[model samples]
Target: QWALEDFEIGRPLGKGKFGNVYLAREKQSKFILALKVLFKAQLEKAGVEHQLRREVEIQSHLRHPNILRLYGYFHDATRVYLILEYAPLGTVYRELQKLSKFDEQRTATYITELANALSYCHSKRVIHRDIKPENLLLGSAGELKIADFGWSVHAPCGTLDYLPPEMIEGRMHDEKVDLWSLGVLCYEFLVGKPPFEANTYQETYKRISRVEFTFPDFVTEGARDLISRLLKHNPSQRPMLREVLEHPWITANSSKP
Candidate 1:
């Protein structure tokens, strides 16, 4: 029953495929939040109504500190409205681009928080297929938050370079696919680029198909070890998320906030 009139809309914060996100504050609670405005026509045209429904269902039910909070949702004739928690610091991708890359401490902190978040999601039978820097948001407290679940599934599906070997081969994938993505995300966090990059999509696919990538000399041995294990070609060989949480690199910097 929440309507547009119940909140005071502010300037647009960003734009997405289906609609734009705006800064908004509710009238009674005076709570500031991000309002995602999805055009109904566009969603229908894209045949992603189910996608939106799944995204809402998954995000709304999960409540963890590292996951972005979906407050509630409502709709109008032409649009669907999603009220979400506002992260004042914005996306990790923007900050990464600003600084070129993060230091080991920063990277470790983010990865740890992300691991914790992903572990929680997996425990709830949700799989966040996409775990790239772009989907990571930062709060004013400097904590990492998993922000988008558009491509996420309780089962499996993921982006190209982040995909596990099984997925590239058209094999059945499980929650372990997220471990592959986390490895890729970790590599990108320290290196400022994906491990499996090439001039064309075909080349990228080929490389990922083989689970091939070389760590730069700049990456510490501890980090290199963790990434290698996480990116193992056999999903069964990959360390569980709990193991990742206790890895030497992650533990060495466990004191990080």
Candidate 2:
């Protein structure tokens, strides 16, 4: 088993609840990669093995440049190693943090890239359930890539914040779940935070189920129109992935320098 010293943790990138990701260079390949070492015991204890497997399965098959690439993985007696694509600019959340609020142009650009990636995944029947900014990454090429999938589900669940109302109340949902998450993400990206905020998880769940969330006053009309349709409480009410991709904000903004 290799420790941090075995592969030289050059610098800290970010840390999540389950694991910490570091930028590392492998002696064998001499190439840089983002190394994520998962605590297997904690994962297993938390009943996340199936979730982890699903993450690996879906992520490996995805080939879009806007989607992070999984180089490979290894497992020993203790930890599970996942070699993922490095996004030097870090998560989209951090990137947006540098701004007072997102400029409509960059927001439109990011939305376009995300829609492209999401549409591609939906074509393959894949739903990136967790579509928050913290789950998105920015590569050196200035492209946005969907990165984390810790809460991603092939099916549906009680994920109220990112889950459609019907799904939370025990109805069915599909990739629209992903769209809903994306809509929430866009709202956060524009307003500098998520739409529904509460003190407790239960309160968040309450707000989620109600579907009464409001967009910020400053959010552009085009952005609001796109997000409203995608954030519909009814899964059936949500627009098709292609429709989302073709929305004005996504398509018409490329003319800008």
Candidate 3:
């Protein structure tokens, strides 16, 4: 029975093919939250009911400062509403657009926080395939929250981004997929883009097949070293989750941050 009047719209946040996000204030106490309202019929039409339910459930169980909080959900016959924590600073993508990229210190701090979150998710056997800037949220306190679990799954090494080289070629994989995604995400955060990309679907697959991509010379040796390990043609050769966190790059003098 809640209508637009039940909440006050502060500003429009982000927009996508499915819906738009807005900053809303709860009327009674003036608490702020982000509302992402998606059409149930649209989701049903796309055959994502199960996926949608799973995502909501997964987000509900997640309790991390680096992960968005799912306040609750509300829906009627036509629309589905997601009550989420408000990231005052907005998405990391917008931040990147303003700065093009972050300084080494800032990047490391953010990455460290994110790494911890990833570790938590992996420990719970949750795999987040899409870890791009668009999916990262920053609070007013400078804390980062990993949001958008639509591409996430409870299955080990859930999707293509995490797909091991062997799995990419139709082999089996486990939690290593998260490491693969971490590798890609790390490179993207450092360089402002994904290492492997293609203009067409076929071309993208072809590039991933050959592990085609190279790092720029100016990139840090530690970063290059880590990325190289993650991009291995053989998944087995890729470093384990614990190894990634223990990498010198992560433990390096964070005081510089």
Candidate 4:
């Protein structure tokens, strides 16, 4: 497709570190897509050219209904462009903000879809180190879509707020980290915030290191049990994604639409 004429640029979807994403439609087919425009100079300056290449490599090959689709990519004189599936319902983050918290059924539905998708990724040996609300998108039908994989790696070099215990302790970790983040996401979905988030970063680190958090009386026993299993201090002790999908709470509440 020609850079200037193949698609009609509409409004901006959001801003990225390197550039911006815009709602665009292909002129010929009228196929709507999110056009991610990244500056080549910014990528090279930040030493993230390799990261962009890896992101493209991993996302382009992944084909699952729950994972965001990467249609194709191209580059102009100064910018690289990625064509991705459009999620008209917007991000899970904004939705959570609007609703404060979700009911059990809605929470379970998104978690179940995410668990299935992550299980598929693990089977392919791809690990998504970052799994959070901001990275999840909602389709018009309200299905969950894993949208960002910039922090994903077949190997892990660093971690984030939803990081597993092993990562915080500077120990080797695997796909279990994703499961830990899943537990955190579940808590946030139901409770409106991460369990370990504190008044300060230092306090947050302490809470995470110690696995210190409490569920309010409003949280059901089943939900608490599942979160406990996934957020264990030991990576080996954490439940697998499949096990999470099979949990009674998820299985009972996550009926497909």
The residue pairs found clashing in candidate 4 are: none
TM-score of each: 0.95, 0.89, 0.89, 0.95
Worst 10 residues of 2 by lDDT: 154-163
- Ordered by TM-score, highest first, the candidates read 1, 4, 2, 3
Q: Which ranges in model 2 have alpha carbons more than 4 Å from their true place?
A: 1-6, 155-160, 254-257
The candidate 4 region of ten consecutive residues with least summed lDDT is: 152-161
lDDT of 4 by residue, 51-156 (tens): 8889899999999989999998899889999999999999999999999999999999999999999989999989888788888998888899998788677854
Per-residue C-alpha lDDT of model 1 across residues 74-136, encoded as one tens digit per residue: 999999999999988988889989998777888888888988998999998888887777778
> Stretches of candidate 1 above 4 Å error?
156-159
Candidate 4 accuracy as lDDT: 0.88
Q: Give per-residue lDDT, candidate 1, residue 251.
A: 89
Displacement of residue 55 (Cα, Å) in model 3 is: 0.5
Candidate 1 vs 3: which has more lDDT: 1
lDDT, candidate 2, 1-257, per-residue tens: 44444465577688756678889987765778888888888888888888888899888888998899997777778888888888888888778788846776777778778888988887777777777777789999778899886666665433356666666667777777877877887787788877776777788878888776787678778888988887777777888767876787877763223
Error of 2 at 245 (Å): 2.1
Whole-model Cα lDDT of every candidate shown, in order: 0.87, 0.77, 0.76, 0.88
Enumerate residue pairs that collide in model 2: none
**Which scores higher on lDDT, 1 or 2?**
1
